[PDB]
Design a protein around this ligand. Sequence first.
Ligand SMILES: CCCCCCCCCCCCO[C@@H]1O[C@H](CO)[C@@H](O[C@H]2O[C@H](CO)[C@@H](O)[C@H](O)[C@H]2O)[C@H](O)[C@H]1O
Ligand SMILES: CCCCCCCCCCCCO[C@@H]1O[C@H](CO)[C@@H](O[C@H]2O[C@H](CO)[C@@H](O)[C@H](O)[C@H]2O)[C@H](O)[C@H]1O
Lengths: 459, 171, 170, 84, 547, 79, 104, 67
Amino acid sequence: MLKYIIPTIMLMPLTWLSKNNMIWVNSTAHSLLISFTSLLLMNQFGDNSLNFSLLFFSDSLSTPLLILTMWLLPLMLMASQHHLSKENLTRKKLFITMLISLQLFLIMTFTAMELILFYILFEATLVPTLIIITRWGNQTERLNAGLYFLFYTLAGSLPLLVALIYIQNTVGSLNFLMLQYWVQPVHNSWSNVFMWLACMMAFMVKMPLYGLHLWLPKAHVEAPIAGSMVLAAVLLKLGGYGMLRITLILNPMTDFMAYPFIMLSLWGMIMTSSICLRQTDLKSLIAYSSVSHMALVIVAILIQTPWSYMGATALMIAHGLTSSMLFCLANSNYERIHSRTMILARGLQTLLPLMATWWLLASLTNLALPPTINLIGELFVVMSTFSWSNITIILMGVNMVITALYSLYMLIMTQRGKYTYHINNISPSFTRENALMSLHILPLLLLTLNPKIILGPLY
Amino acid sequence: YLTHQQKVLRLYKRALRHLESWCIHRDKYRYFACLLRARFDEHKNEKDMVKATQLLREAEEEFWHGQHPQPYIFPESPGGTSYERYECYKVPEWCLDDWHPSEKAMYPDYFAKREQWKKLRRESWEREVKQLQEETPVGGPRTEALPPARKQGDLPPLWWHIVTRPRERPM
Amino acid sequence: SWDKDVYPEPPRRTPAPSPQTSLPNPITYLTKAFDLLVDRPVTLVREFIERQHAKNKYYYYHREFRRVPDITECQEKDVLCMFEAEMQWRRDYKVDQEIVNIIQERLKACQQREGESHRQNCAKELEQFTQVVKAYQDRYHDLGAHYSARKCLAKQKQRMLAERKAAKEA
Amino acid sequence: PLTLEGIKDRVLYVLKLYDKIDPEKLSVNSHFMKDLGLDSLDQVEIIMAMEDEFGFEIPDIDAEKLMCPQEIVDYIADKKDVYE
Amino acid sequence: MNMFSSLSLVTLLLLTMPIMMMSFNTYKPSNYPLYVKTAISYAFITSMIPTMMFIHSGQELIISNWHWLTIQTLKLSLSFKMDYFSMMFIPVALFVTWSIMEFSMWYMYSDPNINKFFKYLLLFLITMLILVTANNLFQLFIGWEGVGIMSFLLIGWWYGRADANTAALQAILYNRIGDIGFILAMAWFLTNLNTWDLQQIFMLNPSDSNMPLIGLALAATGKSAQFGLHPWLPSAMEGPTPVSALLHSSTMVVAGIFLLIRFYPLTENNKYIQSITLCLGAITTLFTAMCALTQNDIKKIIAFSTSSQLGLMMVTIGINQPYLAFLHICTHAFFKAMLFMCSGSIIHSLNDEQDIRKMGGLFKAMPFTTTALIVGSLALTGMPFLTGFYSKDLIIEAANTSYTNAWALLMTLIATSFTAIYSTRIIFFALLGQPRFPTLVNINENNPLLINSIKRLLIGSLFAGYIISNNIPPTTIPQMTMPYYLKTTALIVTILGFILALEISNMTKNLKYHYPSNAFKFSTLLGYFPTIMHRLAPYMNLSMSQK
Amino acid sequence: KMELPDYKQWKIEGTPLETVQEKLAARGLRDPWGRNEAWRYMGGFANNVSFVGALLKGFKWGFAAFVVAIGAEYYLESQ
Amino acid sequence: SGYTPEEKLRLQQLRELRRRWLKDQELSPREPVLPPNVIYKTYRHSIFAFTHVLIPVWIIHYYLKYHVTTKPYTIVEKKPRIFPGDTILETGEVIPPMKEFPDQ
Amino acid sequence: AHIEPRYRQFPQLTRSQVIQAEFFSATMWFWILWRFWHDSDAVLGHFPYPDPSQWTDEELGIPPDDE
Ligand SMILES: CCCCCCCCCCCCO[C@@H]1O[C@H](CO)[C@@H](O[C@H]2O[C@H](CO)[C@@H](O)[C@H](O)[C@H]2O)[C@H](O)[C@H]1O
Ligand SMILES: CCCCCCCCCCCCO[C@@H]1O[C@H](CO)[C@@H](O[C@H]2O[C@H](CO)[C@@H](O)[C@H](O)[C@H]2O)[C@H](O)[C@H]1O
């Protein structure tokens, strides 16, 4: 993994040593080259994973998440440079440096063998994240509202640290390869119930789980576009990636300890989709859309069948590209009207014809139109949870109806109908914006031709 | 809000249009249109406005009972089949500003005439703002009506978006 | 092209044309038009390509995996022996998925081939599909997403205990 | 395609087929109530006939104010974007 | 098989070529609509060669050409089932689409987005041919949702109109409710069997098939707008007339019936699902026919005519006659697509007037539109030996002599009589009488695109039923022995419907003052299903969201 | 650019609009818009087929073609 | 109940401008200034058949004959119907007739 | 515009549309009569329907009431 760590670090000298007017050109060009070389990680095997060294490994789960992470850095740079153009030069380089350091922690996080090494990096990603959201965020409101920092660290980060420390004492190691052979069953015990919650609550909050999700809409309304892109696309998948790994050592206690979280996810899947129908803020609508989609991933991970793990991996990648594109589409409107209200500017298809095509494609993938990988992932989770209990088809089906409703409602409200009379500064879509959208959707649709490389290790 | 005189005439028009929806055939409609007209004529010269109001209220109750479930609606009227059919084709004039110079090079006469209008709008705006302020009582307007241009050379205040509104069949 | 024993097909019996109408058969005429305008030009192009291929002849091989001790012979917590047995079990699991796929493809090919007589003429294919699916279910069903040789063996021993017990009951 | 003269001709045409109007006393500037001595119930009927003539509705708020053929001609011309 | 299979795929591949050429390959936006019509016309010719081979020797194939994905023991491939139903449906749909596209070349002439309109019709056709030829449930799902989205994009064509956006989103809502049944079948077949292939499903032939077949019945209920999920089809009239012609004949609405025909080897041996689809169809065929009696919009009447005929198709499925249900899909596509093209010809002449109360006196004014409308109306109402008689007549005979629900049979016969009433209603108010339209007459049906497009469907509406019914092979034993009063039931109630409708129409001329009725308001307002459901259901959901 | 037909043609006499006027004159009323509807009942729009007439369109020539076809079918039998 | 004297005057003044504006939407004769019989129908159709039928079937036939059909069970025929009295091409076999029908 | 719009009058027609409308109206009636002549059974009945009250006890194998 040093062939990706070292070039990523070298983006920092490159950014600080570029000519003043070349910082965006230089970093975007070279970060796209790192993204190109990330495709060499797809040297996967049917039986073994790609174990590079004592610290890092890659398997079919982390590999697609790594490629998505490395793809997103150039896209974030393209999306950020317009609104940072009035920023002074030293602050543009610090902003770029935060994004590079965020990628450095993410690629290391997804490949760490040792779960304690994963924990330190899994938390180090918050330092660049909060700095980006707060220092370049919209308002004076605190994303780390204090209550959320306390609840998360007390009920999430700290219990996970103690559980991991406890596990290594008992097992003698937290290397994930070792945990595959030395795993022992978890018997019923009040102490074991608390180990289970400790091992899972941190990832539940980051997913987020329904009932622990109110932080996510607040963060999106405050974050800059790059913040929303990384947060939606990857940072939520850190919780999903963590659960897919740590559930190896939690059986068979997950057989019953998962019921409350499945209930929260199955019900919260419908409650958050319905909320999307009465959202007045695009960024909030997309944020609640992510909660609904990540409810499927939690259910898939907790019932742990081969089909649900394949569906979970596909869902995480598909949502990453789709939710990121939706935030970029909303941001482009915001950069003209300077408001997140969804009802303010209407009938935009009349004024921006091609951008309306990007909107339609983003909405069709969001509502899981076949054969997009959005549906492939969602169908697999639906197929698996039907076996878990046939009644779930009712809740899964109803959510499919509602998801189509708010996806097209968002498309209809903003793109169709009569345009707003007094808004007279809607300039034609820039090449930068059109290319930003097409770099989201083309890879998303091309993956329909070869879905196996996003189906994870269970494939 | 309306006068009594307006409510009756609105009920006469609405009554006729629903009667036309029931009758369908022009001769049958013309027969009952004169029967209906006669009913109004029977009470044209009433003077007791208490009776006149009670006559109107009973008429409107009668209308609601005899109302047609599916009255005919002109295609382009609110609720008709063509209502707002061409809104997707109406592009506001300010969009021409953002045209590329190569796009404007295709219509040199049209765009020359368009700067003449934009010049006229500029030179007129200050005068329009004064005329409204001087003619406007203290406390703001009492109604939405707007005045005409008073002098030769002036343009009626607030005219651009009325004059340059999209055609009703833009494409 | 493929192996006829693995993907069997019965001998084809096509009845001879026995026309009983003076009208020309437009299908036979379109067949000649196809055999002339489409097949022969296509065949010429392919034959040229296959000539280039014959000039350059190189070979690829089917990887052979020597057998190693199973998980039943590994020492507890001996990862070095558990690793090789675990990889071997995964390879066999992947192969067994494709053995079931071959049997399903035979069943589906049979149904289409037999037309309206498939219920009687595909009973052998149905029986074979039934037994293979049963054997696959016995091995690998209900192991979970975190399956392994260890959990496969635990399932087997549990099944072996139930079989042994019902023998006493008999 | 409508023209300002074609709208005029059809407006007057419809009025000349009204039995309450003298076709010799009718001109584009003939006020319905002051000149022709019609009532406000007749004015409603006249406007209804123009809606049928041209196939679109004139809302009651606008219809009240059309008290001569020329005003009707101007109203129809404006809604239809006729200019020559 | 080399010629049969090659020509089977070129037809599909050919239809996608105008889509690929949209990437500016010798692009000639001057006449893209003409290019699309030509591709359909050539696609019709090539599709007729496999059809002849099937007619000849019953040759059928599966083409599983591309292996897409394997999920352990579930191999997914791009597989086309080129069988009885695909052989005969594809030429009909291509023939009908060819006429609708030539008609659209004239109807949509002034639309600035003419090219985009034709691209959407081509995609709307492609997703239907993915549906019919699909050989596994996943590929069937791609087409199933494909038509749904194109329905949304074409119903909401005029996107500045809020009513158009509301009808487009209504189609999606009601159709995705039906898709709960589709995924339920997919989940059941994957779990209880181990396949989404139709071949392995029929080979295993489960007896405990209530759950997967209730899922398919629900999926067909929404897509083909049976009672319960039906209001969206009338609402879909917001789209341009050429959209309604395709929607109501050779694409979306028959997909629900087609799905249940595909699975007849399962519904054969399930008397419970047969009883559900019989009753489900029987109420639909009557209820929608009753609604059409009092409608005044010409597009609404034809739209309810479709729901009533789709109800009769669902009845045919429920009396265990799937091959007659298919024969009705084929024949119905001819005269139903024509009726929409005749309404559009009238609507266009009268300057976008769709209300029959403002029509009249068109019998001589529009002679060729009148001829096609009369032929179309007689074909719809089962006039002997026209295209509609070869399916409707056999369906009523087969329903009469089956071990059937008695109430469903009576409701099916009354709906047949009502068919003659609203068909008369269109002819009487649109063509007979004196003109009731504005005074500036722009009636002009003299356009070769309009004449030729309607003429080809008129020829189909005369001979298509006879030609098809004489070429398809027997798959059942038609029951031909039966009492006279059961043999002639369909013709008799059709004739009494015509007689009973003349009296009702003529009383509209008497100088008598009507009196509204509870029955009249019930039929006019569509039984109040939209008014109650479309207000109450959104209210409960939307108010629930905020709190 | 367009020529409106002379307005004095339009008289309600001979149409059902005259039946309407007679029925209204019994009640002491009159129909002032009668001539504005008269064009719908005159000259080309005056006489319209009935429903049975609409269905029987082209029957006369269909039957003439039918008698010749079956006759020509029988002439080919005796031969 | 008619227009007030100011209402008529404002309407008249907006009529002049609105009608002048619409007159100005007309295009000049030069605008837009752009930058720089059986055989015909047969050639258009002949070239269409070649590009949109012959080439596609060449590619499809090549694909099916040499890439699809060379893999097992990719194109599965329904076996032809054999009726009594037939002659099998592959073997030369002769299917016997059916029993003599009873009179009917 | 080869057809001029008219005011309050019956529209101008062409011969081509009137002749084609009549040809296809007469085709429909020829077809109905031609088929009814040759396939009248499809409308009235293909085969006789027996009256079961006529079948004798001998042929239905009904034993005598005292056997
Ligand atoms: C889209 C463009 C992508 C560009 C990059 C990928 C293209 C690379 C193509 C190189 C393929 C060469 O593949 C190579 O072919 C030669 C053909 O003699 C073979 O060569 C070998 O084969 C046989 C015997 O083994 C002999 O004919 C030959 O003497 C021997 O050297 C190699 O065993 C094979 O590996
Ligand atoms: C799966 C592989 C498929 C390989 C296909 C290879 C491409 C072969 C096509 C090359 C020629 C395509 O030509 C494309 O289609 C027709 C051909 O007449 C053209 O269209 C032309 O004919 C139509 C009617 O016939 C006219 O309406 C149109 O005005 C005219 O330009 C398109 O403007 C052109 O872009």
